[PDB]
Amino acid sequence: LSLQLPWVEKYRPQVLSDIVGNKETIDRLQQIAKDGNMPHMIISGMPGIGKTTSVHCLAHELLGRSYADGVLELNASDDRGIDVVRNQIKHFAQKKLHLPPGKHKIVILDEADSMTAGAQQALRRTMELYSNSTRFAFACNQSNKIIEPLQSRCAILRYSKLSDEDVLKRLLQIIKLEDVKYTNDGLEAIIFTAEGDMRQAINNLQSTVAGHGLVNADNVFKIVDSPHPLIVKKMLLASNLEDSIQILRTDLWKKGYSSIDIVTTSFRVTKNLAQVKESVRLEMIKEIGLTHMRILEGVGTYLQLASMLAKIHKLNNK
Amino acid sequence: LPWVEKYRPETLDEVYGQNEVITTVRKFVDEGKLPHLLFYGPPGTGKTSTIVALAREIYGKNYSNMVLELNASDDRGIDVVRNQIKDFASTRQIFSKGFKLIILDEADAMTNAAQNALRRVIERYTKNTRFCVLANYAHKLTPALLSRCTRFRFQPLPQEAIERRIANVLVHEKLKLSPNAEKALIELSNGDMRRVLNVLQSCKATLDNPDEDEISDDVIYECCGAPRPSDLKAVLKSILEDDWGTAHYTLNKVRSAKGLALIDLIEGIVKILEDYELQNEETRVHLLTKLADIEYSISKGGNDQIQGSAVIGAIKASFENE
Amino acid sequence: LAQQPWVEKYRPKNLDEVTAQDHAVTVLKKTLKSANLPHMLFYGPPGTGKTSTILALTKELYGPDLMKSRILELNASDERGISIVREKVKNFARLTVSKPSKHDLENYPCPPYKIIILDEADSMTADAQSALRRTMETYSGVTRFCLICNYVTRIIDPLASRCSKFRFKALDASNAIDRLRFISEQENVKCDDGVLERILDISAGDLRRGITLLQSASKGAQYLGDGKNITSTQVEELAGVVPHDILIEIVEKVKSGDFDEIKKYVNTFMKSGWSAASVVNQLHEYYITNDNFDTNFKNQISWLLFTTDSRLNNGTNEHIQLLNLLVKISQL
Amino acid sequence: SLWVDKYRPKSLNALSHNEELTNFLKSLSDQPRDLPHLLLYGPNGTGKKTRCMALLESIFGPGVYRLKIDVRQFVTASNRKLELNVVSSPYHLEITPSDMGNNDRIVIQELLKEVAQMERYKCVIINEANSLTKDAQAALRRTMEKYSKNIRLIMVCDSMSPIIAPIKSRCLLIRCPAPSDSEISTILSDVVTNERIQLETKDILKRIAQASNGNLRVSLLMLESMALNNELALKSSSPIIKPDWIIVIHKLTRKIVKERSVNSLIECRAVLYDLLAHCIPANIILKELTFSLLDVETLNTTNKSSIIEYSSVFDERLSLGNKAIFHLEGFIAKVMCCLD
Amino acid sequence: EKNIALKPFDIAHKMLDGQIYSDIGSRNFTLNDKIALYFDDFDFTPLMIQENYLSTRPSVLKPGQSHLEAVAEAANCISLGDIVEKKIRSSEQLWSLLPLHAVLSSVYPASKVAGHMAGRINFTAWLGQNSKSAKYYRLLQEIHYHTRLGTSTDKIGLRLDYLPTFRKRLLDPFLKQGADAISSVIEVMDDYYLTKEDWDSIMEFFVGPDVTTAIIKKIPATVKSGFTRKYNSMTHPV
């Protein structure tokens, strides 16, 4: 047997210059690393965009040698105990270490917004008590969920979804490092599948390389578990409602694709239908989103998809 | 013993196919790039057999010490399985080298908090432990858990393979099945072999004659507790051809006597109506939109009689377009 | 003794006392003759005798005294979620089986297992039913499940396969009215002409709701110490049902079609406190089953009533919804 | 000591309107031991809370009015701290669990279990029962089943439709219609004779009753406001005094009818922001605006039909949204488009 | 630094530009770019669009369509987007609906009323109004807690019905009687356990013709001094 090292873990960024997206936030973090004084910061944004990686890279940049022991990572929603993690924070902060005067120990907490008001007040008191030695970083989805004192004391950094250009640049870097043979349509397919999700894009690239070796559209969509975009495009653009329903019933519903995947792929494909007028695309997107809302409420049947197709067809032919 | 345990596809030969997943996992192991795997699809496709075969091939004789098999949904709760995983990953033998595999079955049954805890555990022990997650529906899993794992989808078995397996089960169990009953069973199971085996065993149990009697489609529909196509066809004919009083009476009488929920009646009627040859497309547009609205309203509660009359009116009004 | 609800007071005691469910009672008698009792799935219209029959079967299996210890009655819709129900079932199964006395052993078969009755099973979600199936599989050695529901099609296939299904026919109007009349005579309830018929109509044939309404009417007539017969207006009041005169006035105002008259009437109507949902339900009943309206009118009015009911179910202002509904019908 | 509160009936004998309901409540107090769970539903400001308190006084005595107020603290899952204002007496409790939002279920469970453990029985008055969540109502049904020995619930709501059927089956439905204009006039006449208010004619009281639209609280407060404005001498020419927010909404209605443009819509937005910021609920604003628009005499049937349809749509949207100004502005824009 | 505050303004100005909604503008600036504009600072973009979508001069009007019809359609879409946002940010955590919320709250309403900006891109007023509403609801809750024993009403009923008559009984006597009315005002306050802080809070709730800021300011300072002195000189019920 041998050790396992996935590409996603292997090529996670280490220095702040490795991160591709969020140019302004990365520039601010680089400035903070340069001037050698980390303030308390709260990073917020939509979930799954890799917020904690930025503060880990910041800690690596700040601590030239103390990066191994000067970083503590915890999860606020971890049911091991809010009091338990608070006590661990107190122990880590009270544990002084040899450092240059401008640096401090760094604690990273995830899912801070899910904490109670009392828990946030306790963390605020702890941060004030050990502000001379340990600085805190809070990762949250909604900034307003964090109490006002913490927001006022901390510096808010906003993290946004990565654009397709950043995903393309990162994928090209990984491909060059991994001598991956690819085609432009394959990378376009991977970027299309992973809507700003760097982790999913890297995972799909690795899986496609393992499965087929060549990264082209057909291989990518064979590896990818979502419905094929060409099938969804044929279903959406069919001039006859019977044809659209037939394509759905045969190629998507009977193939085992879930309704969530179908509506998500419909949203993705409709958004990119360049030959259709944008007003028509917006109407189609509105209908697809309505059925997505219905599905997420627990209906998620075949009749909802058929009705979505009926409304889209009604829009298309005017 | 349950008929699901028997006739289980314990070997790759009994697997219907789609060995591309097996080959890709094998190449992941060979290249040292094996990620946390997620196998999902219809129940009974053989995900458990595939993963145990892969584990046997990877490790060899030292199977039980390096591989831990668990069911994510168990009566002992989240804490017990979490403790099991933590004590399995934390402990290291003298010959500790490589990685250790943990397999979770029926992971979609876990609650969101349990899934988040499992994701945190996977992230913590990822240095020396590789997780394989099995589920029936990938969409039921939390997006946070889906991001960690590499998704592999299992296609439903082709109808010919299902028919061959059904014939094998019938000849092994000495059961005679009507062709209509077989078609009904295949349609109801929609590719789930576990459902096929359970329904066949229950139907054999319910027969007054254990071996000589023939299982009809009526018996299959009673065993599954599903709307019979004859009832739905009668309701649809009454709606289309009879006046409002007769249609209302027929719908209420049929779906109360036979115990058919209104949403199941709508689903069956939509399934039947798809085979109709409609001259006008507006008929289909109105039918689909109105019936979807009615079903969505039913999901939220509301007045049942009003919703039934809404179904009748929606079907009647659309066919005015011919 | 203290006062007891008439629903549980007049349940049939033995299987021979179930009136109209000949088929289900016969099949259950045959199953009881066998020493092995499978999982049972009771389905049919509400208030037909499902819980009564399962209780009678349990009483015959265990005896009047041992029945309480061997039975756990649950309601899957009443509980917070799956976890509480499954934990209660686990605790009941882990609890040691009660010791039957010599009389219990010699007068009744006293099977070793314990029967668990789960009411309103069809209201469970798919995940809840799958967890229930897993729990049933875990403790199938000592517990036999009975699922009581109105729609068998709302129960998932894996769970429904394990259960032998008994279909209960809807009670005929004559049988239900005779049962209500017997209850009224036993309890000395003075009822005028058509009061029991009105109770059945309000309950939509549900004998449980009919008995509950009859008991409430009897208590109300006890409060009003005039000693007179219960009137249909009183039972309409106790059920939150709008009087037919107000419904006819609403229909006439809609027929005339003047917007201002309809608005004024709805403003006056909302001050009386009558429920708007009851008005929508009774308007649906009036219009749909009426021979003086053609097919197109009813096609339109069914959708109108459906839209109004859907909006009312969202917790909206009753006045606005009712006015919109009445104005839209007047334009048909 | 406002006249609406000074002359509130403190007993079942002091009630003056809806005599049949008073007789029924008197009959209920004759057998306190088997008191049913109650659910009182009707229009606002008709005397439901007064009748509940009078029934409590009949059962227990005047001590029910010795009301003391306290704050109870509860701990939820994930250790969330809650505070509920519980108005108590030596005999009864009053709670408004809807004030806790979706956390009303746990509050109800904990408080009712505590009261049952402490205890022949203690009456709990639940205000705004129609705004309780479905989970809270299920918990209430469970507590009714468990603690019927020591807990008797008196739920008060304005509409019984949001109440679930299982609760309705286990409670006695009591319908409280709004008083007629004659009864309101009689009550106001009693008040003015008590307070020594000059009246040119009794038709002024009829006008107040008509303007109050069956709301007895509103009619009493309007009478007091009118009396103060006229130095305790009401004349036949004395104008009806309406609240500030109603005047603002009527001004908005006149503005919408007069001019339909985008600038008018911006100024309507400013007005709506003014109303919402000062604790005027969005549903109240929508209802008042809709029924002011329908009373404009220059509009035809088509305009009014469109207005009521848009009102229904955007009322449903208000019940499902977060930011109310969005829905109110959408409704006003649609009405402006339809009036053209 | 300051560019962070200018990002929502830039996004709102760009999304309401009518050039990017013509055919050529759509080709040059596709729908993906517009949704990406939303996802840059997705907290404020729907608020800015709802704030500024009435201040444009539309150039994308269909033939026979007026500006008012376009703003009505945009407002309808904004309301739908608000419902979607509520379902997203609730406990269900439906973060997969973010692109749908983008289209419903930012892109579609902008498409309906895109054009030249008639004026300036104003910041959203909803945040300040929400804070003000929360403050006034807290004040109303405090007043209701103080006056709950004496009044038979809920909090909303207290705001809608009781407060005008409380204004007649607590502020009007000062205008016509002056310092002579201090005793009666204090007596009325004592009957409802109203502190002077509650007296200050009550007068802030009135709108339209009943605003009391100028009226209170016009009251002589001697009357206010006598009022506070008399209140502080006697014990009060609690």
Ligand SMILES: Nc1nc2c(ncn2[C@@H]2O[C@H](COP(=O)(O)OP(=O)(O)O)[C@@H](O)[C@H]2O)c(=O)[nH]1
């Ligand atoms: N004189 C008199 N006043 C009444 C009567 N019923 C109600 N009221 C008045 O109506 C006002 C409001 O009633 P309230 O208790 O708030 O009823 P609710 O808000 O509808 O539950 C009270 O302040 C009473 O002064 C009655 O029978 N006689």
Ligand SMILES: Nc1ncnc2c1ncn2[C@@H]1O[C@H](COP(=O)(O)OP(=O)(O)O)[C@@H](O)[C@H]1O
């Ligand atoms: N077949 C029947 N014969 C006599 N009484 C019946 C019958 N069915 C229902 N009831 C009456 O209905 C009441 C309870 O109904 P129940 O059986 O709980 O309804 P469900 O069928 O929904 O369980 C009992 O008091 C019983 O008298």
